[PDB]
Ligand binder design. Structure first.
Ligand code: HEM
Ligand code: HEM
Ligand SMILES: C[C@H](O)[C@H](O)[C@H]1CNc2nc(N)[nH]c(=O)c2N1
Ligand SMILES: C[C@H](O)[C@H](O)[C@H]1CNc2nc(N)[nH]c(=O)c2N1
Ligand SMILES: N=C(NO)NCCC[C@H](N)C(=O)O
Ligand SMILES: N=C(NO)NCCC[C@H](N)C(=O)O
Lengths: 414, 414
């Protein structure tokens, strides 16, 4: 009938009617959460006719991977998996296949720029987990390992796969560590304005609002389909970096800081027909994420206004290019602060150059590399980065990390 | 069989084989010149069965435009056009329809950010033109009018429409004014490295290589299918802006300048089935085009290296964010230089804010707005601009300005 378009800045929604008047051969590339990048809920297990081909294809991919194929084992695995499928409905991946799966799903993540690190990933097997308290412990082990007191390590914690569709393990958080956002009495908003609706959710589940700008949100976990249990993350585990500019000593007076761990929590890993709706992963930060996005977005911390004021820029004249001046410094603050406090971080320039190297390796190796230009090009210095001048193809392969419908929208409350 | 991908920086070409292994519902949005945005050559006129519906649809669009429809004239025009079509094959647009066409084709240009100015466009009717010398004169009138000694004016010069497909009026230039590029003896390259192949083309047609960094290229015009005649543009017409930073007085020592007129020359206007393969248009510049793209692209002037050196930045350490510092200043140089020499220019921030206003007007007015995010988002300060957080739909409507196959690749030489 029509297409819904949203402006993530003002949150304003629009309805596109015009596209109907279009010619022959509409691209939706600009859309944030398209259904094509989302893998939703279920009620019944994966139909056998669908699971089997996917499984067989995955197993052929895995065995067709190493240097000198173990054909007998390949044939044996195919056979054992087929049997296991017709015997239980679903099947279990060996640890080595899961390891391969996670790396490949990352390797196939069109929106990730750090993919040159794809072969360096720690896999935490939490497939035997069965309770919320148990998830929480697995998560803590993850946060601890990943953090490594600054020298961040890429890692992923794979929880139990989806069975019938009503026994899903899900983390209700955007990411492991994430500040809270509250709409204060005086009309304002303190903290991360992006976690507003979620923060309220934690409040309704009995969370203690510490009303601040950097209040690490609680872990909201759901095990085997039972309602979510609220667990607070042990502060000793949550490593942070206090922002401070190497020149403007008044920068630390802003009282800015940010967590060192970028651990996406709400994504689903699909592989060989199977699907893990809970499998938080992490790599390390890239400056612009915090410096530009987190700190400067209108819908986020929105620090630009005063960072410019304190630099003495013509804040009421757009053409003065003050925003470009401010942000650049905020970015250096971040890179410096992290680099100083010995926390692994990467600037967008070096990141872009390493990705270009990755694309080359990828095309020569498997003849391609799924890439989402819109996401790969840094939020600043677009054409200054090599990836801006690189034409790219965006496609979904398998394994793959899909998005999923926010759990609170689709959940039964016992 | 496979998809060709090019890196416009290194000019390197790659072949994507992987996309075949993709799932259900591949976006090519990242591609520069897709066939979907190109309208090629022909040998025979537009088949009547195709022309008539398009014509009728266009005429219904035009008459359905004004406030209180002139139904009788609407019906009369439909009738007269139909008759004229079955009588001559093709048909002629009234001046008022052409005016409407050009504005609408601009209005439907998914890659243009200045579209809020769509209703302010001067239309030059050169449809009666028949010789190269005549084109040249029409072009000069355009350049003169558009320039207006700094106070730039949006304008378009429409030349004779395509008839049989072998009597095309074409400008072989990328744009009206455009510097030359030569590959000097010492391995280097002087001027605009983007116009290399074209500059050589002018040289072969007897052009006098003035071997410099800012040598305005000749107008290569082809009338009614006769080979291209080379005409040099009168220097009095070519207005330029010498670059100079408001603080770094050593900036003017770079000897930088750029033309004030952004007049795209090689595009085709399609409307009501008809198509004008020659219809150069112009609006005014937006800083980042010159400051970031023209001056800093690796494939262009590539000034970044020394602009950074002269600012005393750590040119051998990427993470120092020197490139972000340099470019910002180059951008202010441009904005200042233009603003100082009273030449109309627009910074990307104000441009982005006016476009957002445009989108709103557009959606409320016709229920949509074809937008290409990849092109609309400035080459710098991505997320700092409102358009970065705006989800958008990219589609081709009619009328429309299509790209066309480079004329030298498809031309008969008598
Ligand atoms: C090791 C260094 C890594 C770097 C520098 C890196 C960097 C990034 C960046 C800059 C983004 C965009 C984030 C945003 O704007 O929201 C991203 C997205 C993504 N990354 Fe990577 N990443 C790394 C590791 C990983 C790992 C280890 C995985 C998974 C195993 C991964 C999976 C993804 C996925 C799925 C996305 C999409 C996020 C979304 O759609 O919201 N990344 N990464
Ligand atoms: C009046 C102010 C205008 C501004 C500020 C403006 C700005 C721009 C900018 C920034 C681009 C991207 C250029 C590039 O990166 O190559 C562009 C592209 C474009 N503009 Fe506008 N423009 C204006 C007027 C016009 C007019 C009057 C027309 C036509 C009647 C027009 C037609 C287009 C088209 C077709 C493109 C696509 C160019 C391509 O695909 O290479 N623009 N414009
Ligand atoms: C609407 C638009 O798609 C959206 O704002 C985008 C653009 N590109 C992005 N790229 C990255 N890396 N991260 C993002 O959140 C976004 N968001
Ligand atoms: C490969 C990629 O599509 C290309 O470099 C783009 C990106 N976006 C752009 N946007 C604008 N405005 N102008 C351009 O030339 C480009 N080129
Ligand atoms: N670098 C990564 N993953 O490895 N980032 C994940 C998303 C983090 C998000 N962009 C933030 O800044 O909060
Ligand atoms: N602003 C416009 N059109 O109005 N630009 C047209 C393309 C010019 C091109 N980007 C250049 O800098 O040479």
């Amino acid at each position: 009938q029509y297409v819904r378009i949203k402006n993530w800045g003002s949150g304003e929604i629009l309805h596109d009617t015009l596209h109907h008047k279009a010619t022959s051969d509409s691209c939706l590339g600009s859309i944030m959460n398209p259904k094509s990048l989302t893998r939703g809920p279920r009620d019944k297990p994966t139909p056998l006719e669908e699971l089997l081909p996917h499984a067989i294809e995955f197993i052929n991919q895995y065995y067709g991977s190493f240097k000198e194929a173990k054909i007998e084992e390949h044939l044996a695995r195919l056979e054992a998996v087929t049997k296991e499928i017709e015997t239980t409905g679903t099947y279990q991946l060996t640890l080595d296949e899961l390891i391969f799966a996670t790396k490949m799903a990352w390797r196939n993540a069109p929106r990730c720029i750090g993919r040159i690190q794809w072969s360096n990933l720690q896999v935490f097997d939490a497939r035997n987990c069965s309770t919320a308290q148990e998830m929480f412990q697995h998560i803590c082990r993850h946060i601890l390992y990943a953090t490594n007191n600054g020298n961040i390590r890429s890692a992923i914690t794979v929880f139990p796969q989806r069975s019938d569709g009503k026994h899903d393990f899900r983390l209700w958080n955007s990411q492991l560590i994430r500040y809270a956002g509250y709409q204060m009495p005086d009309g304002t908003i303190r903290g991360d304005a992006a976690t507003l609706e979620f923060t309220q959710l934690c409040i309704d589940l009995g969370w203690k609002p510490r009303y601040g700008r950097f209040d690490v949100l609680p872990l909201v976990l759901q095990a085997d389909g039972q309602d979510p249990e609220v667990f607070e993350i042990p502060p000793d585990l949550v490593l942070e970096v206090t922002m401070e500019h190497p020149k403007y000593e008044w920068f630390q007076e802003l009282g800015l800081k940010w967590y060192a761990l970028p651990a996406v929590a709400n994504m689903l890993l699909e592989v060989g027909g199977l699907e893990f709706p809970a499998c938080p992963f992490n790599g390390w930060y890239m400056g612009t994420e915090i410096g530009v996005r987190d700190f400067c977005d209108t819908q986020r911390y929105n620090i630009l206004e005063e960072v410019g004021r304190r630099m003495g820029l013509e804040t009421h004249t757009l053409a003065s290019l003050w925003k470009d001046r401010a942000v650049t410094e905020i970015n250096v603050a971040v890179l410096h602060s992290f680099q100083k406090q010995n926390v692994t971080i990467m600037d967008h320039h070096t990141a872009s150059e390493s990705f270009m190297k990755h694309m080359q390796n990828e095309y020569r190796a498997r003849g391609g590399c799924p890439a989402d230009w819109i996401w790969l090009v840094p939020p600043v210095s677009g054409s200054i980065t090599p990836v801006f001048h690189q034409e790219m193809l965006n496609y979904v392969l398998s394994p793959f990390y899909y998005y999923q419908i926010e759990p609170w929208k689709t959940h039964i409350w016992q």
